CSV table of C-alpha atoms in Angstrom, one decimal:
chain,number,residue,atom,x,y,z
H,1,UNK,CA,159.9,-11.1,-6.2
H,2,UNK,CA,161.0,-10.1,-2.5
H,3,UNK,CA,157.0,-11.9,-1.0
H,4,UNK,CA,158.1,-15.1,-2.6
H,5,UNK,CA,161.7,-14.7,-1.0
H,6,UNK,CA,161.0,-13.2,1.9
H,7,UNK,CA,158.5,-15.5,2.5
H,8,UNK,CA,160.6,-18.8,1.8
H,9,UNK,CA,163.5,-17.3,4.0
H,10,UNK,CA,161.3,-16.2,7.0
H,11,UNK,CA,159.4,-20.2,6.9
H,12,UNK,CA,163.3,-21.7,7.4
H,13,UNK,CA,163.8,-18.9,10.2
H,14,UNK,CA,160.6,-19.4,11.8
H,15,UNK,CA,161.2,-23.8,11.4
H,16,UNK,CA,164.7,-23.2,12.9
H,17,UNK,CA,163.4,-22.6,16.2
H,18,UNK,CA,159.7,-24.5,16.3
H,19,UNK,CA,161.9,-28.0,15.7
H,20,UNK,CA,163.1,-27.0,19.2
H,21,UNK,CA,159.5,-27.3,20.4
H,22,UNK,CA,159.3,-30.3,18.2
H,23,UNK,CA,156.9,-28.9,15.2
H,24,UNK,CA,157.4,-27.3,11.8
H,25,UNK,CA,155.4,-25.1,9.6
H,26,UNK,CA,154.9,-25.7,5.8
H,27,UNK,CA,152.8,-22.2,4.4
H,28,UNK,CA,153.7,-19.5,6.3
H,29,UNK,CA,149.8,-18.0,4.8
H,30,UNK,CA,148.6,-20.9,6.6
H,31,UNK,CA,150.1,-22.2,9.9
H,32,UNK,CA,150.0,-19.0,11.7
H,33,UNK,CA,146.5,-18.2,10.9
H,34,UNK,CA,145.3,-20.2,14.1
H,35,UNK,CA,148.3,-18.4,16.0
H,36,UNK,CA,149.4,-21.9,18.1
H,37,UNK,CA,152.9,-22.0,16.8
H,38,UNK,CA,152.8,-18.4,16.4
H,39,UNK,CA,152.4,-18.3,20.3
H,40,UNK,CA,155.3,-21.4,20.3
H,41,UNK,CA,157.4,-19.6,18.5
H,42,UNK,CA,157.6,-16.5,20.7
H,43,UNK,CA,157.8,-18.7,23.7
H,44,UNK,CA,160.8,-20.7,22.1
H,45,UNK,CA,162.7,-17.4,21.0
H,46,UNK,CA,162.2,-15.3,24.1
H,47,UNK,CA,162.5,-18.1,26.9
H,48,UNK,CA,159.1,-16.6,28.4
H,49,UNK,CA,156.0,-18.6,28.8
H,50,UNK,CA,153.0,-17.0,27.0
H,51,UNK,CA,149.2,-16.6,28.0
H,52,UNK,CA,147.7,-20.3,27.7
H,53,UNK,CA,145.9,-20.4,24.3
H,54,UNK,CA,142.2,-20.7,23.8
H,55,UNK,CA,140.8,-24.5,22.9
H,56,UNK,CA,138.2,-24.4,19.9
H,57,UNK,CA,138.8,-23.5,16.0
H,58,UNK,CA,136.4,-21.0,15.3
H,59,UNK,CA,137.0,-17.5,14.0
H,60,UNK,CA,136.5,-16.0,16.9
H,61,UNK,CA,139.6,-18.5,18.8
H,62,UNK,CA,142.1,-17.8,16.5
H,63,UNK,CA,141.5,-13.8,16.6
H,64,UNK,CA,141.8,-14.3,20.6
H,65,UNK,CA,145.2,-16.5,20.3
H,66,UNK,CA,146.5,-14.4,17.8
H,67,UNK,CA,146.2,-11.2,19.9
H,68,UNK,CA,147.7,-12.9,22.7
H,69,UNK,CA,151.0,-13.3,20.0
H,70,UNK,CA,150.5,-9.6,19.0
H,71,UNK,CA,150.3,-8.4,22.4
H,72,UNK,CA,153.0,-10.1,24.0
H,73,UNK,CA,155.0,-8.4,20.9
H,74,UNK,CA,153.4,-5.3,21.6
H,75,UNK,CA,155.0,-5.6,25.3
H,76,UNK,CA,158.3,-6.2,24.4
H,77,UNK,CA,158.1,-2.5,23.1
H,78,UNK,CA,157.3,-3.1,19.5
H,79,UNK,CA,154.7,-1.0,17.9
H,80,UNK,CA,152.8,-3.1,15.3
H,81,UNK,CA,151.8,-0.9,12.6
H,82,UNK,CA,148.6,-1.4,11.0
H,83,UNK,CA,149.3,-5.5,12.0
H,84,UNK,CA,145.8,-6.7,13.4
H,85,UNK,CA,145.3,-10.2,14.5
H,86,UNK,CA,142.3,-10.0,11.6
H,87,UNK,CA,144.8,-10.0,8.9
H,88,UNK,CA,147.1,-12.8,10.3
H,89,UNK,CA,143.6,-14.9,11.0
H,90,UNK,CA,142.6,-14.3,7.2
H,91,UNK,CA,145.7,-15.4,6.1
H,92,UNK,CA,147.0,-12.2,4.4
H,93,UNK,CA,150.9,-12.5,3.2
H,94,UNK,CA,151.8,-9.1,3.5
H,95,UNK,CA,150.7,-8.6,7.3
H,96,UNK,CA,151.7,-12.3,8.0
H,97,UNK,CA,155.4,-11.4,6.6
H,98,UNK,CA,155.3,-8.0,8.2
H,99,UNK,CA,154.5,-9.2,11.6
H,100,UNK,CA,157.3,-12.3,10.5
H,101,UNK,CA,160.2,-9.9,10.5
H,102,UNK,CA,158.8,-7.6,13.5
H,103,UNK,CA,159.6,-11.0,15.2
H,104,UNK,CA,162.3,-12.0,13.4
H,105,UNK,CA,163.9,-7.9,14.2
H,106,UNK,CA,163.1,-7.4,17.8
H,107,UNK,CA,163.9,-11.2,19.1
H,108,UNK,CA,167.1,-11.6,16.9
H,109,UNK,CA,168.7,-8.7,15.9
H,110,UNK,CA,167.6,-5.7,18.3
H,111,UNK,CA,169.5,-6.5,21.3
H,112,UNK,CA,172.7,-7.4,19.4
H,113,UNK,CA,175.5,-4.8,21.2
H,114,UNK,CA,178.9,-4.2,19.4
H,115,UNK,CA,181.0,-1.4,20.4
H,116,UNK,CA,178.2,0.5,21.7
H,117,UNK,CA,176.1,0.3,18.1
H,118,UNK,CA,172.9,-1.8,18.5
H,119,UNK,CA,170.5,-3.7,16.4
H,120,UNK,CA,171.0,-3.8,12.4
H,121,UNK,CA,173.9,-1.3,12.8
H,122,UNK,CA,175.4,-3.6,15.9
H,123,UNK,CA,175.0,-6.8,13.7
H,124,UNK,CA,176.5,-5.1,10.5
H,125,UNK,CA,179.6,-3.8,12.5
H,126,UNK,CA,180.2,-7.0,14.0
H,127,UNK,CA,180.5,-8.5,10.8
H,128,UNK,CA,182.4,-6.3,9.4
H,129,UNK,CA,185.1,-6.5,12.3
H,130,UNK,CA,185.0,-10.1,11.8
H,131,UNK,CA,185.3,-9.9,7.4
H,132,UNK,CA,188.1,-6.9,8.4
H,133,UNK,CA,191.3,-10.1,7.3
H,134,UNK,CA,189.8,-10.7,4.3
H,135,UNK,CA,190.7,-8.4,1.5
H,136,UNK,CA,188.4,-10.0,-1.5
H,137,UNK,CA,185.7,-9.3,0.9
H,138,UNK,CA,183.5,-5.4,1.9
H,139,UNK,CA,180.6,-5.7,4.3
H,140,UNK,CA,178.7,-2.4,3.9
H,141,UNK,CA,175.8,-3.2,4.0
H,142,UNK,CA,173.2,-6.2,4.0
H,143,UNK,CA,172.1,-6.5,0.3
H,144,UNK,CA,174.9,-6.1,-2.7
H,145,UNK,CA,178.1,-6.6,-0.3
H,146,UNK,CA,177.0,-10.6,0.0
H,147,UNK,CA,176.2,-10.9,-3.9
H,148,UNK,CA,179.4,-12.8,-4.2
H,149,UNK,CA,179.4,-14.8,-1.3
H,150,UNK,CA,182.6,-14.2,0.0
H,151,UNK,CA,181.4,-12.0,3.0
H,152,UNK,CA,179.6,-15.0,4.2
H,153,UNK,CA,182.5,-17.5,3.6
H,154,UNK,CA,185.0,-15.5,5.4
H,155,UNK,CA,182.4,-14.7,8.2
H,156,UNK,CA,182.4,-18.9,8.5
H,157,UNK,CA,186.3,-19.1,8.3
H,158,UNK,CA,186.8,-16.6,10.3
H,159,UNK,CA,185.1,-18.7,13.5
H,160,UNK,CA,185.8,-22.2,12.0
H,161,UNK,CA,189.2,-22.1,9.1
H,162,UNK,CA,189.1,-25.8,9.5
H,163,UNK,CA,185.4,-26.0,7.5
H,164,UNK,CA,186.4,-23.4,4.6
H,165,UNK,CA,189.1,-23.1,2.6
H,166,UNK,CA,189.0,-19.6,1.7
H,167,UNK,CA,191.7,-19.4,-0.4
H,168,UNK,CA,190.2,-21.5,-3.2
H,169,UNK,CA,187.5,-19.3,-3.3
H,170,UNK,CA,187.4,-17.1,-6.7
H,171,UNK,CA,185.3,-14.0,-6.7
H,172,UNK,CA,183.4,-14.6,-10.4
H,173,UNK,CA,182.0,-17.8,-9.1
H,174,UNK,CA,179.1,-16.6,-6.9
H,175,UNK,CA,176.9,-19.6,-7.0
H,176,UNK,CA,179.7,-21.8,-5.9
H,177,UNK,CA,181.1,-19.5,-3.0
H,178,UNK,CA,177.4,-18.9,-1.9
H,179,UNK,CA,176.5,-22.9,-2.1
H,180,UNK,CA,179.9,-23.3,-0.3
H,181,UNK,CA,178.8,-21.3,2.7
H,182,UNK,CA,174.9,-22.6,2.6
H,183,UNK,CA,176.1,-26.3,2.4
H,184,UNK,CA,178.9,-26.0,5.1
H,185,UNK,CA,176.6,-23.5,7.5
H,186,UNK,CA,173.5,-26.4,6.9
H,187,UNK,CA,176.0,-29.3,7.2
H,188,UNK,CA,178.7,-28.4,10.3
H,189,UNK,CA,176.5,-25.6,12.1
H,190,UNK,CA,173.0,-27.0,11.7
H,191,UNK,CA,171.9,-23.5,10.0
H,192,UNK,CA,169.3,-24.3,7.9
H,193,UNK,CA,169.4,-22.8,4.2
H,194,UNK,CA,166.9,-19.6,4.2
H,195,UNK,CA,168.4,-18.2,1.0
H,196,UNK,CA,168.2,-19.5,-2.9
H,197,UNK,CA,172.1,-18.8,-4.8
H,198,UNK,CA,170.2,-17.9,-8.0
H,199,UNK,CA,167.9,-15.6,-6.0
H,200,UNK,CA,170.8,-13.6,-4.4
H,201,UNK,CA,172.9,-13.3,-7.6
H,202,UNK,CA,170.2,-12.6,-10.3
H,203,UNK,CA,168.4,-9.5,-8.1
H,204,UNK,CA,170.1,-6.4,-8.3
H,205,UNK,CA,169.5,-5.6,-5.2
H,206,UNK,CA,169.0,-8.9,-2.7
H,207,UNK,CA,166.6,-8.4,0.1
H,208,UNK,CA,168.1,-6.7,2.9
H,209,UNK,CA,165.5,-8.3,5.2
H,210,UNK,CA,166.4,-11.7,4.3
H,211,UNK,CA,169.4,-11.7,4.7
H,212,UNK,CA,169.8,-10.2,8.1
H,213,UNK,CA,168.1,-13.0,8.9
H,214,UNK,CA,170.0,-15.3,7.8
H,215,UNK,CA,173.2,-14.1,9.0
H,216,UNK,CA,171.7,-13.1,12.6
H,217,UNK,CA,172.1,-17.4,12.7
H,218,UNK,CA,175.3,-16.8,12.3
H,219,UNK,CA,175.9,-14.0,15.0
H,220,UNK,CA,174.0,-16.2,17.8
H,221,UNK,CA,176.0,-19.5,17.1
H,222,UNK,CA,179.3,-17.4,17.4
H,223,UNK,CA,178.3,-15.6,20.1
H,224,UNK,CA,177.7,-19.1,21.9
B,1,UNK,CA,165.4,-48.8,31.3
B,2,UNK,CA,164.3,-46.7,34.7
B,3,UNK,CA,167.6,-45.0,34.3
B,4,UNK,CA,166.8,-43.3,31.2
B,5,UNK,CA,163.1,-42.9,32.1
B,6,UNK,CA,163.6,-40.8,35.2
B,7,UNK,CA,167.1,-38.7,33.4
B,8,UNK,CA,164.0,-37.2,31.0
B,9,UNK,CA,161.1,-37.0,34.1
B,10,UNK,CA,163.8,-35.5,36.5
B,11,UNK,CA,165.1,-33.3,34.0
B,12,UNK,CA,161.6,-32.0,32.9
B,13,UNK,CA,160.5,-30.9,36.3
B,14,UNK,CA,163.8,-29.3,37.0
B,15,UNK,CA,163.3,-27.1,33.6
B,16,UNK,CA,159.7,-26.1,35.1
B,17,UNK,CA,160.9,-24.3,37.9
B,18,UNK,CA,164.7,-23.1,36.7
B,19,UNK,CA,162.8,-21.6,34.0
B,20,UNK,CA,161.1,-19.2,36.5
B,21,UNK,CA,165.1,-18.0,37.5
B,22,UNK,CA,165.5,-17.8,34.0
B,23,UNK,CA,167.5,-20.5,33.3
B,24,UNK,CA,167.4,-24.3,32.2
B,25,UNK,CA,170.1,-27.4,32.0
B,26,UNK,CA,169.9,-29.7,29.4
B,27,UNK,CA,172.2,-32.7,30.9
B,28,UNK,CA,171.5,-33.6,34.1
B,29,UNK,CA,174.3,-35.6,34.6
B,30,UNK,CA,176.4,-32.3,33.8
B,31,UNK,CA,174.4,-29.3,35.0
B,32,UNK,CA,174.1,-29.7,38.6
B,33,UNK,CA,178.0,-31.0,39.4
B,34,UNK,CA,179.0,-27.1,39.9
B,35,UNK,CA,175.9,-26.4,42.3
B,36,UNK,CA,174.9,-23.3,40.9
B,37,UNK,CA,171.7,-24.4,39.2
B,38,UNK,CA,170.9,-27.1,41.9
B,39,UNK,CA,171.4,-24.3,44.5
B,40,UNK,CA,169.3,-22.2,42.0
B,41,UNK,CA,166.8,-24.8,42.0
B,42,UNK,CA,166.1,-25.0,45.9
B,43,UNK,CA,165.6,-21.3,46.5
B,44,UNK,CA,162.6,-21.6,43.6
B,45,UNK,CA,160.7,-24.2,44.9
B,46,UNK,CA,161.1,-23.4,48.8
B,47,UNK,CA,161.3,-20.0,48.2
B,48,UNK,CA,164.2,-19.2,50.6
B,49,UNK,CA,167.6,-17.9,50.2
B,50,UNK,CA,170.8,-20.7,50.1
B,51,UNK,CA,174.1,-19.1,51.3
B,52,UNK,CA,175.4,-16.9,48.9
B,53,UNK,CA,178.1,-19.5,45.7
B,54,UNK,CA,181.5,-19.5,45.8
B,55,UNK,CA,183.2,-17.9,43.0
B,56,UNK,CA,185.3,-20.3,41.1
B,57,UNK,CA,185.3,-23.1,38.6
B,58,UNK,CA,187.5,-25.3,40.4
B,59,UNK,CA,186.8,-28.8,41.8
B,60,UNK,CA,186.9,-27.6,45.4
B,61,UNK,CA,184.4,-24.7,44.7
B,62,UNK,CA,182.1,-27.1,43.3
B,63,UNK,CA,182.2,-29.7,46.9
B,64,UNK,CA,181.4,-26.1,48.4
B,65,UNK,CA,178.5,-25.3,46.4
B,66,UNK,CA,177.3,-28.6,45.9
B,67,UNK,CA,177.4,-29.1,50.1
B,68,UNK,CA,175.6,-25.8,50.4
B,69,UNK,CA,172.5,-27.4,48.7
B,70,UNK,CA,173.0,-30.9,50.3
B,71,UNK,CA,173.4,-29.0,53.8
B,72,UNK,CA,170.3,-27.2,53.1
B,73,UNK,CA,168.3,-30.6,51.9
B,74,UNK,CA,169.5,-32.4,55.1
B,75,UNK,CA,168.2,-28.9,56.9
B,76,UNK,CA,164.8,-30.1,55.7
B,77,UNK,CA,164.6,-33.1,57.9
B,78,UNK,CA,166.4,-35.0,55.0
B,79,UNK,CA,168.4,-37.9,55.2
B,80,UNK,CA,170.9,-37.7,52.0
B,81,UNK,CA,172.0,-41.7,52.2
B,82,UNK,CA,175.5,-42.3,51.2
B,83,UNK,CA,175.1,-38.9,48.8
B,84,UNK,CA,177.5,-37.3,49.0
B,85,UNK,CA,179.1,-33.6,47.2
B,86,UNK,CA,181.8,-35.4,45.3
B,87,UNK,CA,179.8,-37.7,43.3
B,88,UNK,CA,177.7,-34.8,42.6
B,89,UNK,CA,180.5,-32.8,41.3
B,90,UNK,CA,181.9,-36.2,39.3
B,91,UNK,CA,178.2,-35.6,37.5
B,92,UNK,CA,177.8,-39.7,38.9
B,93,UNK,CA,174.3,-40.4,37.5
B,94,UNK,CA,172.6,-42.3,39.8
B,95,UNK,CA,173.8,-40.2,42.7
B,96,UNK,CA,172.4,-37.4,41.1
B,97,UNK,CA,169.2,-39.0,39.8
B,98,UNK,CA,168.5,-40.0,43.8
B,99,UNK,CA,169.7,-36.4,45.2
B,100,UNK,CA,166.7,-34.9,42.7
B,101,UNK,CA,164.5,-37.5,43.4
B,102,UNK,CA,164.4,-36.4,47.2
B,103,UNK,CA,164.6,-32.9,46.4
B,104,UNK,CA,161.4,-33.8,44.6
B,105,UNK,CA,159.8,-35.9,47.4
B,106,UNK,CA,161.2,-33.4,49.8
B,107,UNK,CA,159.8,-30.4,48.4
B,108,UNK,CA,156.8,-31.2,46.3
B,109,UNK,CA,155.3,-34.2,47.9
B,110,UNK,CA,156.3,-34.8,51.5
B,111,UNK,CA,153.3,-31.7,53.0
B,112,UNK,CA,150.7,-32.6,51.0
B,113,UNK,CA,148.3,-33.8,53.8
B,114,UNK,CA,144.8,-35.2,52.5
B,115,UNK,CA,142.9,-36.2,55.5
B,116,UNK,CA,145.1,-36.9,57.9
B,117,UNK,CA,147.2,-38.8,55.4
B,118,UNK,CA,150.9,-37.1,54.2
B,119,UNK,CA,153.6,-37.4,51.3
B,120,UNK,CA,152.9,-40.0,48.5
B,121,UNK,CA,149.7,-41.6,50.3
B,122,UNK,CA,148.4,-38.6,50.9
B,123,UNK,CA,149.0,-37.7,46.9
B,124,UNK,CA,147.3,-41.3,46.0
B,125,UNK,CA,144.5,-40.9,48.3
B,126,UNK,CA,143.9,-36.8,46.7
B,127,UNK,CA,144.4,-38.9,43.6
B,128,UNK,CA,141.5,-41.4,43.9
B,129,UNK,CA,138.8,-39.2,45.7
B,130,UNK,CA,139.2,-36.9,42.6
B,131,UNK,CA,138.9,-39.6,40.1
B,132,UNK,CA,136.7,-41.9,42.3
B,133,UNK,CA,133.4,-40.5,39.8
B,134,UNK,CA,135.2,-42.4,36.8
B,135,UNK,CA,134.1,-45.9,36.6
B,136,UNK,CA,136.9,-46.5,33.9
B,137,UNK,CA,139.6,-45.8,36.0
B,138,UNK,CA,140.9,-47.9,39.4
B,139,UNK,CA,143.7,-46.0,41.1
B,140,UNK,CA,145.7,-48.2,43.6
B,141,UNK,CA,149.1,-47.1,42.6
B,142,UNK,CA,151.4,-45.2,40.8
B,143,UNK,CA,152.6,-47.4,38.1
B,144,UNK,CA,150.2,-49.7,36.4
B,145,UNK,CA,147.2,-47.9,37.5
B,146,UNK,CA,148.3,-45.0,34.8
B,147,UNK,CA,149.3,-47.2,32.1
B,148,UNK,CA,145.8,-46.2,30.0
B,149,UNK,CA,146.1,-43.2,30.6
B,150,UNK,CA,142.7,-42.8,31.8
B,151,UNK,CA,143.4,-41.9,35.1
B,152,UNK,CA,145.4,-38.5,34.0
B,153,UNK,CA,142.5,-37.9,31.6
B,154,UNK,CA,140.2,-38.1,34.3
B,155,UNK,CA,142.3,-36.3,36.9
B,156,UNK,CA,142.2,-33.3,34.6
B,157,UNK,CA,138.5,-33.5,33.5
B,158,UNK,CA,137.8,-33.8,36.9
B,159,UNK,CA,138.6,-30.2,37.3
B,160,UNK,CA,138.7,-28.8,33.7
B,161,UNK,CA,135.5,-30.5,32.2
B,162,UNK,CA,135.9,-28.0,29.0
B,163,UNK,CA,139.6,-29.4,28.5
B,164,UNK,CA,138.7,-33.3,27.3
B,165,UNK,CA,135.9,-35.1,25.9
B,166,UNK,CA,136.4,-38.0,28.1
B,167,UNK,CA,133.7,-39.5,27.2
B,168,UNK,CA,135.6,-40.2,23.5
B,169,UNK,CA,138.4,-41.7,25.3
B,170,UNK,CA,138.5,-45.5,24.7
B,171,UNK,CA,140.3,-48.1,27.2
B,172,UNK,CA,142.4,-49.6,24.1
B,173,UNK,CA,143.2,-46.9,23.3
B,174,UNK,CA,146.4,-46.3,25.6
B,175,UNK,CA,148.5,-44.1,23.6
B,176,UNK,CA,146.0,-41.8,22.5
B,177,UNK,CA,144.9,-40.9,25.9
B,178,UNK,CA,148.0,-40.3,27.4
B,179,UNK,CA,149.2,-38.0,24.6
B,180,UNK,CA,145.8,-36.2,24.8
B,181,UNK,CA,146.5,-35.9,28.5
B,182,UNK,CA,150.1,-34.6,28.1
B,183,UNK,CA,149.2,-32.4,25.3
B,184,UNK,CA,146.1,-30.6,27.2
B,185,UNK,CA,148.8,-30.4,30.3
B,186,UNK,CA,151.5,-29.0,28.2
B,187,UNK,CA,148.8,-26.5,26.1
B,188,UNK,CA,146.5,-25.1,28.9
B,189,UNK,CA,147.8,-25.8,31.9
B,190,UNK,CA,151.2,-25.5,31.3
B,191,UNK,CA,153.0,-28.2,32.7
B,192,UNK,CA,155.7,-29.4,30.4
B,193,UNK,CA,156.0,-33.2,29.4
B,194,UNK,CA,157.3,-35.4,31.7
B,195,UNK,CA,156.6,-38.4,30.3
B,196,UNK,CA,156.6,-40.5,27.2
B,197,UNK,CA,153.6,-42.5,26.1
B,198,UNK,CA,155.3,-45.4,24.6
B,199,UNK,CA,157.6,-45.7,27.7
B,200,UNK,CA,154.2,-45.9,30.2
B,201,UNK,CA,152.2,-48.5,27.9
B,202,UNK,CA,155.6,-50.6,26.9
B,203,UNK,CA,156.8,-51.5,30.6
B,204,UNK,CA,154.7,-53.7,32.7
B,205,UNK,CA,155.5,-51.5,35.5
B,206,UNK,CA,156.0,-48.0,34.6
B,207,UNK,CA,158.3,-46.4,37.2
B,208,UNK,CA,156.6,-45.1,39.9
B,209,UNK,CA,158.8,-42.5,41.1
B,210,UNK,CA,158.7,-40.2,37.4
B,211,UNK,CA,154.3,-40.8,37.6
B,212,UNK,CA,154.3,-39.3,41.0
B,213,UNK,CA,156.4,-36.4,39.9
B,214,UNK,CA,154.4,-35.7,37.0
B,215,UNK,CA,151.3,-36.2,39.0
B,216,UNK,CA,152.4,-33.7,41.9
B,217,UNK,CA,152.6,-31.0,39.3
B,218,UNK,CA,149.1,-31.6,38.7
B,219,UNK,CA,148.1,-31.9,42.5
B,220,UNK,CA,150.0,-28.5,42.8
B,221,UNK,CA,148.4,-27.0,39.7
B,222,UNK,CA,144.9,-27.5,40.8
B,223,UNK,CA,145.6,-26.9,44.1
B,224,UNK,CA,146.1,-23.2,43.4
């Protein structure tokens, strides 16, 4: 259940930024294959300008443009494990998504700083300082904590009270509080939706990954 | 119609050298009235040192930074004509549209020297002996002479033969070969769009200051 989550999620992450460099993917198994906006995509997030990509469309092409992607990734002191530009050229979902969140990691959530705690730990401690008000509401950690959607509502409230009003929130209505933060976030911040209310409430457990992505968003247009 | 033509041109070619600093502005008629990015700008592309900013946010902090880069234009055998720092720091548009334009003159056009001939002839003349082999293409100017698009497609096939099919390109077809020109720029040769097809083929006479900054980037690309 996670692929076809993860998968939906890391498409409206990965869309969020190419639209900046006025383009859009629609299958994530698909439009990286040929590594172009791959290669875009790390020049949008990073601000760096990349090697110039090879013209043609054989085989051959793509395994060159994508290892100019994996390489530039590679210098930026990630290790890609068992991720070969073969497996993003054939189109395979598990190393496509893998190499996905290795982006989506190190470009948006590694150098995030709080009170001398980095990465996922900076990014979680950050948001619980800033859910700390709101009693209804215990960030700790990324998966179960956001289940109800409160921890996301406040997190808005908490930077805009004028788009949220969190005291009409009721804890045993999940979908609503969740919808409530995806609608105004989409609406008032111009943060796509990357996560499904039924998704996050049915599972158990909700993705961890996906939702760090998601609320990374929300730490970068605060921090602005 | 010029106004909002050379606002995008202008603002392009700034981006492609700030970005080297690290940096970018996204409103010209805002991002250069404190002087720290237009300062930022002329050490780039002369590759000197300005005196060092002012620290400060007021008005009269941004006259002093503002006058450090006029002074050092002026320095440059420029004559800045009724520009003057406080219509800079009031973000005036067309005042700021002509300081850039003869920061662009100044610095990116004014030495080129093609046989014995300087500045925009000499860019023209570099312009026609390059495309002289193309019967499809007549460069006299730098305004209606561009409007197929032809001539840029030509320009770069005459030093990247592998980059366009220009034997494909069609005369009616106006739109398509200046987007296949600005695309190969952007792609291989990385140059940044400066330009908008629509804009070049809709105006009888396409401004002539935004083709020649455009053009220089080429003259300076190829010239490496």
């Amino acid at each position: 259940a996670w692929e076809k989550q993860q998968r939906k999620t890391f498409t409206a992450w990965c869309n969020s930024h190419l639209r900046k460099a006025g383009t859009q993917i629609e299958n994530i198994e698909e439009d990286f294959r040929n590594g172009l906006k791959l290669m875009l995509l790390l020049e949008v997030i990073s601000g760096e300008r990349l090697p110039r990509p090879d013209k043609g469309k054989m085989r051959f092409h793509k395994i060159a443009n994508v290892n100019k992607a994996l390489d530039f990734i590679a210098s930026k002191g990630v290790k890609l494990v068992s991720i070969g530009a073969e497996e993003i050229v054939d189109g395979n979902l598990k190393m496509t998504l893998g190499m996905i969140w290795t982006i989506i990691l190190r470009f948006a959530i590694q150098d995030i700083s709080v009170e001398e705690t980095s990465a996922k730990e900076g990014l979680l401690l950050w948001c619980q300082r800033k859910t700390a008000p709101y009693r209804n509401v215990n960030v700790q950690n990324f998966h179960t904590s956001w289940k109800d959607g409160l921890a996301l509502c406040a997190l808005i409230h908490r930077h805009r009270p004028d788009l949220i009003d969190y005291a009409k929130l009721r804890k045993d209505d999940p979908i609503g509080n969740l919808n409530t933060a995806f609608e105004v976030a989409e609406k008032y911040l111009d943060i796509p939706k990357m996560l499904d209310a039924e998704d996050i409430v049915n599972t158990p457990k909700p993705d961890e990954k996906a939702i760090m992505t998601y609320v990374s968003c929300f730490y970068h247009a605060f921090a602005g």
